[PDB]
Amino acid sequence: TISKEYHIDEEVGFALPNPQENLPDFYNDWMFIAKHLPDLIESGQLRERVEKLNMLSIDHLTDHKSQRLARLVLGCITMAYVWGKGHGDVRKVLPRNIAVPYCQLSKKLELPPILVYADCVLANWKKKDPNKPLTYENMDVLFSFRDGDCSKGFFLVSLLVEIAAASAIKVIPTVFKAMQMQERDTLLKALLEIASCLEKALQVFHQIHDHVNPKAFFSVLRIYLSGWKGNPQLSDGLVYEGFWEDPKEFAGGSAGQSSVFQCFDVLLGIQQTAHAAQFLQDMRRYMPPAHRNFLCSLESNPSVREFVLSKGDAGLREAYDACVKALVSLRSYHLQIVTKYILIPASQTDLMNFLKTVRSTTEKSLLK
Amino acid sequence: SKEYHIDEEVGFALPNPQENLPDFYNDWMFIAKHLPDLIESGQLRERVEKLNMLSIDHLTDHKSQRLARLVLGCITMAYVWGKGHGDVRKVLPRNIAVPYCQLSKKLELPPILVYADCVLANWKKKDPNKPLTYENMDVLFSFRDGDCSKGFFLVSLLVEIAAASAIKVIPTVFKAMQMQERDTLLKALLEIASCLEKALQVFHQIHDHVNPKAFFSVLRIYLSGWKGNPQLSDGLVYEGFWEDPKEFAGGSAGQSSVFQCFDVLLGIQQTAGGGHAAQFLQDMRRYMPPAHRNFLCSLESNPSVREFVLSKGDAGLREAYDACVKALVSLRSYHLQIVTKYILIPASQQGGTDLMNFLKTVRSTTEKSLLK
Ligand code: HEM
Ligand code: HEM
Ligand SMILES: Nc1nonc1/C(=N\O)Nc1ccc(F)c(Cl)c1
Numbered sequence: 011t012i013s014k015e016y017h018i019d020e021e022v023g024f025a026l027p028n029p030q031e032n033l034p035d036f037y038n039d040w041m042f043i044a045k046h047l048p049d050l051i052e053s054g055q056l057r058e059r060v061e062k063l064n065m066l067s068i069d070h071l072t073d074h075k076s077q078r079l080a081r082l083v084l085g086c087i088t089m090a091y092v093w094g095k096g097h098g099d100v101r102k103v104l105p106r107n108i109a110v111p112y113c114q115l116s117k118k119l120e121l122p123p124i125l126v127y128a129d130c131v132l133a134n135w136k137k138k139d140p141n142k143p144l145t146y147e148n149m150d151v152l153f154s155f156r157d158g159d160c161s162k163g164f165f166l167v168s169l170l171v172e173i174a175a176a177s178a179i180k181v182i183p184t185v186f187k188a189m190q191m192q193e194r195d196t197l198l199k200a201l202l203e204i205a206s207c208l209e210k211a212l213q214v215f216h217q218i219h220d221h222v223n224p225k226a227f228f229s230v231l232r233i234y235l236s237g238w239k240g241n242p243q244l245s246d247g248l249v250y251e252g253f254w255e256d257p258k259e260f261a262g263g264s265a266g267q268s269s270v271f272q273c274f275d276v277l278l279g280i281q282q283t284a285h286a287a288q289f290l291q292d293m294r295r296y297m298p299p300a301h302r303n304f305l306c307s308l309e310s311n312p313s314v315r316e317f318v319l320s321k322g323d324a325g326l327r328e329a330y331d332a333c334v335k336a337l338v339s340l341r342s343y344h345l346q347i348v349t350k351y352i353l354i355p356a357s358q359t360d361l362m363n364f365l366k367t368v369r370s371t372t373e374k375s376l377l378k
Numbered sequence: 379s380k381e382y383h384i385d386e387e388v389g390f391a392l393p394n395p396q397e398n399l400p401d402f403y404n405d406w407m408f409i410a411k412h413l414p415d416l417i418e419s420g421q422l423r424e425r426v427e428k429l430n431m432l433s434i435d436h437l438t439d440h441k442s443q444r445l446a447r448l449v450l451g452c453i454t455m456a457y458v459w460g461k462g463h464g465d466v467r468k469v470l471p472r473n474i475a476v477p478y479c480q481l482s483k484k485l486e487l488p489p490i491l492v493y494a495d496c497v498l499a500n501w502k503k504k505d506p507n508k509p510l511t512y513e514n515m516d517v518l519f520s521f522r523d524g525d526c527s528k529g530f531f532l533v534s535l536l537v538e539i540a541a542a543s544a545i546k547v548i549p550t551v552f553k554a555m556q557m558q559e560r561d562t563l564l565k566a567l568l569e570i571a572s573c574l575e576k577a578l579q580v581f582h583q584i585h586d587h588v589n590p591k592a593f594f595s596v597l598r599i600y601l602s603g604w605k606g607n608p609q610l611s612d613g614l615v616y617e618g619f620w621e622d623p624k625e626f627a628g629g630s631a632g633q634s635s636v637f638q639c640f641d642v643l644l645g646i647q648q649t650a651g652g653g654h655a656a657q658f659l660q661d662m663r664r665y666m667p668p669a670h671r672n673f674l675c676s677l678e679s680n681p682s683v684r685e686f687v688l689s690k691g692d693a694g695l696r697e698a699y700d701a702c703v704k705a706l707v708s709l710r711s712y713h714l715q716i717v718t719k720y721i722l723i724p725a726s727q728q729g730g731t732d733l734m735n736f737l738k739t740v741r742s743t744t745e746k747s748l749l750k
């Protein structure tokens with residue numbers, strides 16, 4: 011009834027639980043820049059401060075939490091440096107003294123050297139009062155890009171949806187051991203509890219409107235999350251000075267990098283990685299290694315869908331269809347969020363096709 | 379190992395594969411058992427059309443499902459490439475396309491001939507009481523006469539089986555890391571590297587039984603897929619199973635779980651990084667049998683042997699670990715020579731530079747993992 015060392019916490023699931031906040035003193039030269047990105051980009055001195063930097067060693071980042079915090083600090087500094095004010099004064103070469111420890115640390119954690127969902131959502135937060143529970147008022151992100159980027163809202167809302175699904179993930183072992191022992195009654199309870207938590211997760215998703223402005227997102231934040239895989243601004247990729255001879259390409263942030271949704275697609279026999287199936291497959295590369303491992307474990311198990319269909323059991327079939335419907339709801343609301351935050355401010359098509367097909371693949375998986 | 383379908387003696391190979399299908403399918407088997415003669419006469423493509431959408435349901439157990447997947451897979455290649463002179467068909471007939479895709483999605487494999495089919499499930503012993511060697515062994519199917527396919531497939535198979543006796547050690551390695559039996563672990567690593575050096579010695583046989591021209595000109599053509607292939611630039615239409623064309627990669631020994639297995643075990647980070655090699659090797663898993671994908675998965679979800687060895691500051695262990703990494707480096711380095719002989723040189727009398735960079739980078743990634 012538990013998962014091993016997939017780094018899946020009981021309460022926060024795929025999130026890094028109570029992330030680190032400060033680095034060892036050695037790195038105060040790094041942490042400074044990260045703690046003041048909005049103010050350094052305005053003054054136009056971010057890049058100078060980056061380029062006047064010593065090549066620090068990663069070795070004093072001893073444990074996992076600090077290694078991550080550092081990965082976030084560096085990741086943000088990188089985004090900021092590459093996009094600048096985010097008007098077009100890009101850079102195509104990342105400075106030696108930052109590029110080196112970033113790629114070192116990245117290949118140490120088996121993650122790509124670019125800011126990802128695992129960094130700016132999953133490891134970018136804290137409680138205000140540690141004795142109070144997890145909720146937007148009691149919570150705050152550690153780093154931001156610009157003032158009025160609404161990044162506190164964007165990151166936390168996302169995080170809170172992840173944590174909502176966390177209380178459904180801890181059920182999965184119960185599901186499989188129920189399929190084994192044949193304890194039909196349990197299995198039903200488990201499936202129902204999962205769908206409950208996913209409907210919850212939608213209710214949490216509603217908060218996005220309250221804390222993220224459409225223009226603030228599309229115009230400001232979106233820019234700093236952009237990568238260099240197929241990006242015309244850096245059509246060859248980015249040169250990582252002192253680590254790679256040639257440019258390299260890496261995808262910007264997406265919540266395709268959230269293990270939550272892929273996890274439940276897998277669990278429920280929703281065959282989405284078998285084009286989109288390609289994107290979604292690639293996005294795993296940007297998930298923390300243990301989480302990739304976890305999704306993997308799920309695929310190497312017996313199909314819950316098969317099990318339910320064999321049993322000719324109305325109760326089950328509903329319970330299963332309940333979960334599939336919860337996902338269908340989540341993706342459908344998602345499309346509305348994209349309409350509001352990308353599609354409309356883009357005004358003053360291919361992307362909608364992508365999301366619509368994924369949802370559709372989810373809806374086909376119903377038993378009806 | 380549980381039900382990863384990894385046999386003790388033949389590893390990833392399908393052990394003692396089926397040879398005949400139920401009588402219902404004698405209309406398939408026929409074509410498969412005579413592909414060389416039907417392509418010559420130019421009647422293969424007729425015989426394929428004049429065919430009746432049979433049902434897959436009489437293929438009850440795994441071994442028969444696989445034999446059928448091979449029969450169909452070969453028939454498909456043969457039909458698509460024809461005489462292999464450059465007339466290619468772009469629509470696979472309904473009465474074969476349907477049961478092929480049915481069976482393929484039943485075994486969770488792509489509907490195209492793959493290493494798992496034409497190497498791992500395409501053989502038999504001549505005398506069942508005699509051991510596994512080229513003289514006592516034979517493939518079940520072939521494409522043309524003088525394609526040297528018996529040699530190509532069996533040599534490959536025999537290398538797989540050589541690495542099989544190293545795979546059965548892996549559980550010993552991990553349970554040694556746990557119980558902290560340093561001595562056990564050393565023995566295990568050494569035994570692994572031994573079996574991989576063996577596997578190279580077996581690889582040597584390729585020169586004896588495969589002709590370079592017979593391979594590059596004949597056999598290579600029938601193993602080609604339609605992923606990024608200009609001949610079928612959109613992919614292939616599977617009549618009665620898919621609206622649009624679909625793309626699928628041709629046979630590669632990138633589809634051998636052996637090498638990816640040991641890369642994983644030894645902390646050799648190939649399927650990570652930006653480039654085309656990591657992505658290719660990651661894709662190729664899709665073309666491995668499902669239980670073998672599952673197995674590679676397990677290995678990644680274990681503690682890193684590399685880490686464990688580096689922590690210990692132990693000369694013996696390092697040497698044992700480096701032994702294995704060296705064995706792989708050797709295998710890949712010989713591999714490059716085989717490519718030079720069989721693709722690179724005959725390609726000369728009729729680009730592949732980019733192609734050699736690929737293999738060279740993979741090997742190089744293997745050589746960097748060395749400790750000393
Ligand atoms: C304004 C906020 C958001 C925008 C503009 C947005 C936009 C998009 C876009 C464009 C894609 C597909 C292409 C790409 O990622 O580049 C996508 C996919 C996805 N988004 Fe979002 N998204 C937002 C918020 C969220 C949130 C809060 C979640 C979950 C908590 C989420 C989950 C996903 C998932 C899981 C996918 C992959 C497709 C799928 O799983 O069905 N997104 N989103
Ligand atoms: C003898 C003729 C062979 C030729 C012409 C050949 C050619 C090639 C080519 C062209 C590739 C790159 C794949 C692509 O981009 O299409 C490749 C990869 C590979 N080949 Fe071969 N190969 C041969 C035999 C073997 C054998 C016998 C083995 C092992 C038993 C082997 C193991 C591999 C592996 C493992 C890869 C993936 C790269 C790697 O893991 O290092 N090959 N081969
Ligand atoms: N992709 C995206 N591009 O912009 N927002 C999204 C989105 N879902 O797709 N997810 C996403 C949501 C919040 C985030 F902070 C990040 Cl880094 C990624």
Ligand SMILES: Nc1nonc1/C(=N\O)Nc1ccc(F)c(Cl)c1
Binds near residue numbers: 492493496531629630
């Ligand atoms: N790739 C390849 N394309 O042709 N031969 C190879 C090769 N290694 O790369 N291995 C391989 C060896 C024997 C085979 F039958 C097949 Cl289908 C693939």
